[PDB]
Ligand binder design. Sequence first.
Ligand SMILES: [Zn+2]
Length: 1277
Amino acid sequence: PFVNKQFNYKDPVNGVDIAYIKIPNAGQMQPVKAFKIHNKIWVIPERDTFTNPEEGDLNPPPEAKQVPVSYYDSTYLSTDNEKDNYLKGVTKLFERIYSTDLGRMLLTSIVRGIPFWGGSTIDTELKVIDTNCINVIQPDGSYRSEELNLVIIGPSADIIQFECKSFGHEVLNLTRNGYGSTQYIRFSPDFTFGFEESLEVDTNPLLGAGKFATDPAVTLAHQLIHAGHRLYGIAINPNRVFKVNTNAYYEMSGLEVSFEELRTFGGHDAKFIDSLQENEFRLYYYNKFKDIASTLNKAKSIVGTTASLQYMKNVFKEKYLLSEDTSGKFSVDKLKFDKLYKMLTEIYTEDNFVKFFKVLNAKTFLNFDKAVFKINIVPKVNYTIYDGFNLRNTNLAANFNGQNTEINNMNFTKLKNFTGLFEFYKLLCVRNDLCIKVNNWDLFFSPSEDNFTNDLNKGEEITSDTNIEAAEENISLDLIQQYYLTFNFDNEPENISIENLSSDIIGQLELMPNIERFPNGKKYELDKYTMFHYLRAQEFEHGKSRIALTNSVNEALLNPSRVYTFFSSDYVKKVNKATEAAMFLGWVEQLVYDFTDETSEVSTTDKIADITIIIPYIGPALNIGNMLYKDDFVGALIFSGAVILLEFIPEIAIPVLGTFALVSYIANKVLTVQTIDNALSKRNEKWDEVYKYIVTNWLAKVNTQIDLIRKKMKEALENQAEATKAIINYQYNQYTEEEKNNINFNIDDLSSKLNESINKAMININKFLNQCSVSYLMNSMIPYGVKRLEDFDASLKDALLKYIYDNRGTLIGQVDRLKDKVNNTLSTDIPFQLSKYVDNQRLLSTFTEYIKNIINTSILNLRYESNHLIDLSRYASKINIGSKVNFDPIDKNQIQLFNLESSKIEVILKNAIVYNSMYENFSTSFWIRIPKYFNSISLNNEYTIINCMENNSGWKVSLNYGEIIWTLQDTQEIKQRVVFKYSQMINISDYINRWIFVTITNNRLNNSKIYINGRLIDQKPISNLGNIHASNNIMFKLDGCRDTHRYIWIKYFNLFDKELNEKEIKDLYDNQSNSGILKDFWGDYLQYDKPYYMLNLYDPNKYVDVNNVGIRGYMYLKGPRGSVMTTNIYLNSSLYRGAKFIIKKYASGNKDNIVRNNDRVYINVVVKNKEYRLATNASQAGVEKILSALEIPDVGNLSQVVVMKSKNDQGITNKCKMNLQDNNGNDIGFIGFHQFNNIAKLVASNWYNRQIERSSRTLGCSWEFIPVDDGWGERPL
Ligand SMILES: [Zn+2]
């Protein structure tokens, strides 16, 4: 820390702060020269050759160590100069670390570390473990033992194998027992690791060129964070490793991250460790301290120094944050411990440092380094304490340029990795065997299910004084700030003179686990091609090959010029074809554009709330489609969901949650009323544990994969840009030889381009990915955990209601409110807040948008997507569709079901995901389309359309002559039904043969409501209905319809696991109305070329009629619209009356024949088997324009274009649908009628236009198109 005096290697040894140290090693050891950069921190610029006897050889091994990166240089740090530079650097980084709040604290804990005085010399005595000191050679040839705390030596063989090294004890785990011991950090500030980014792009649009460098400070900071743990004897056993599955072509051959490694990194990595294991350690170390206190508390004497036993007892007092009374006895204050621990453990972590140092760095410990670099930090021009590489001013600070080894090329010297490229690998063969050498450190992680401990099954007794939950302070910079303030920076252990130790302190390193070499080669003969294969097929041989030509098909990895793409053929074309230099730059522009073009493709799939943004080429870039129902990734993903991306499917074991036992109290109100609260509280907490748990499982099994892909793609895209830089290159590589011609093709600029083109591409791919992650979590992992909670919840309620009962008379004046409190709480879940377990601004932000759409909420949501009737909410397991089930050809999401027992759709919901307390509070909505009841059979015949019962298992939608019903019924067969009844004796109905939005709400504690088209039609209490079954499957089929020709049309069936409120209902309702599409009088999308009868909503009793064809003729509303009936059944004004209307395309055609909100169209009036053209003369007289049915060829420049409408300019629905316009583009007006001497000719008046703005009064322009419909048995006269 800080380091007071600037050293130089040659500076004369002086017994202190610069001496000839004799580290505690084994056997003899010529003293080594080390400096004291600070109280308790020495620096030996030698290669760690001493610490380990079996490590004196600094030469590389004929066999490579299974590590992604390695580097050797027997000669490194040999010269006396190198030492000095090493000295200069190790320091500068301490200064770097030290110049940060976080840094500052850590170095104070490290210096304060001080290995406990074990040396167990007689219980009661205190003593120094000589292995924690060093002998310091004084000038006069003497030597005085000195206590040490942390030492920095040079790297051993493998230069970049930085690590913490401590000497062990004969019988003590000085690193895992609380004692702590002097640490020897093998570190070098002359080499770094290069890594690649593929996220920051979101914030940094112009992110660096390629591989970035890792600020040495972080690395050092990472290593100290380790010395910290060890100094405080809190290091996790290195026998604790996150097991990894290896057998699989996609799995990582070998890799064993330690918990203490995942711990030290922090970020999410640290979240891989389940809560149960987390607290396992805590208590473990919390007890190590308790013994420290004990050890101290009974220490009478102290052999060794001339420092007061009190002094000593105090150092360790101030170290471990012990608390002592007046007698001087020590104790471990749990609450105070949790803090110290929390600090050494979660505040001080690599990720947290990456915040203080504002540098770019790996965002996970599982992001394997791909390089080594020779850096030189000493010169300020290179690296500064404050800015590092990203120097102020310098063009390095805009986008971690200083860290970009390519941009800041001058500061990074690409060295030779010593792990080839296929050292550790896997052999992947397709089905010409067709295999590929896939790099080990290039395969998938894949945590072993073992790792995820749990313990969620243990039930629990809930006394009255149980201890309630605790936050999950995500260690925000704010919390750090707090810690900083409350941080104690003054006073640092004195250099307590200890009595000389052995001239040769006997060492012996703590024993690290053995490096289990891992198998290599391992062959994999597979079926389908792999993402690895595809990726492979996009690299192509360096360059000395023949001008490679892009070419689809995986066989694109058989030719020496093996290259493949996921781009549109045309690109292939443009690229694969000679281009005369006369015309070259054009080409460049072309490709670039086309690149940046193809590369930015994003599907909106708005009609799919869940995963909005979509990058289609992903499927064919990584062959992600996983081969399903043949191609169409964007359709593939939709049919399955983000699952189609996982190289492997993670499971979620969420045991049958235990239960709370309730300790009862005899005639003790308080104590009782307090237990119920503790019960409920712990339950709340109970939900948190589960959520937090699946987030850990989601964080390592799922999210990790998605991230690999995230890289993979980024890899892909580059593989492409790299070739299009090859090809294009080859061309100009055979240039005309004419200088001055073109400001150079600037390959180092076309690249600057292709860079951006890809950088943005990733911005899209990333969003897309983030969605598949969050989303996958929400519909494939949470549901499971929830089920169990909801179960638990369902149980606890009883257990609680009972408790209350069993204790009434003691809960005298409260046996109701408590009964209400328990019933009120345990009647709704505990929302899953992702922010409670994740800081990730990326994912949370995502999670937020996902939550906004109430649809992603639904436990069942089935639309007709792509080519299937699927349950986008991923709850259904098998959606069996009948054979007599028809799907409207237009909007196939409109299902029609007949009376035939063969037309039916049954949906079964994944059992594991289905809890029986599922239908207490829940809503259901769907759009209905009921034909008209013509017969009388229909009367008093209630057929059922939607049924979900398991022997009296409530709710099943039924129909009966002019009414829709919803009946709830419990096992105790008590049933309650709410009904919406619609008369069939109306001129014009709002429900007959039309589409009706229906939503049914259910609140166990309240009533069952039925909403028709948004408004509440009726409600009936249900606070009396007993328990209800949770039917595993729902059946869509009419049942008991005596009518033979009865059928219905359902649409947008959804099922919500909560009581949708009015607002929600109305929102949901407006959303499923496709306001951008005009409608049938019955609700279908209006359509082009499809004769409709006009029904004027203002004067429903009339009907359009063409007085006389021609401009000298007119159209008007004719007399009395006939009636229709069938005594005792219906008496509706007739519809299929008057002249038909035919909408003709005019703007954007050939496309679907659906008429959309703002289409310019043509209205052909069909007069006497002939079709004319409704037009007018915008040059008439008044505002009104009479309109006539002209002869299509005689129309000419007359006003005929009608702008169809659906949403008022303001945005409000309006019936006024036809706005006529003059060719000049003007606005002649909406079409309506108008009295002209008691004739009311159809007219296009600009009046409505005006009114439609103001009010929303049904106006004379309130038209309605009526096609003939099998639902309206009426016969078109
Ligand atoms: Zn580490």
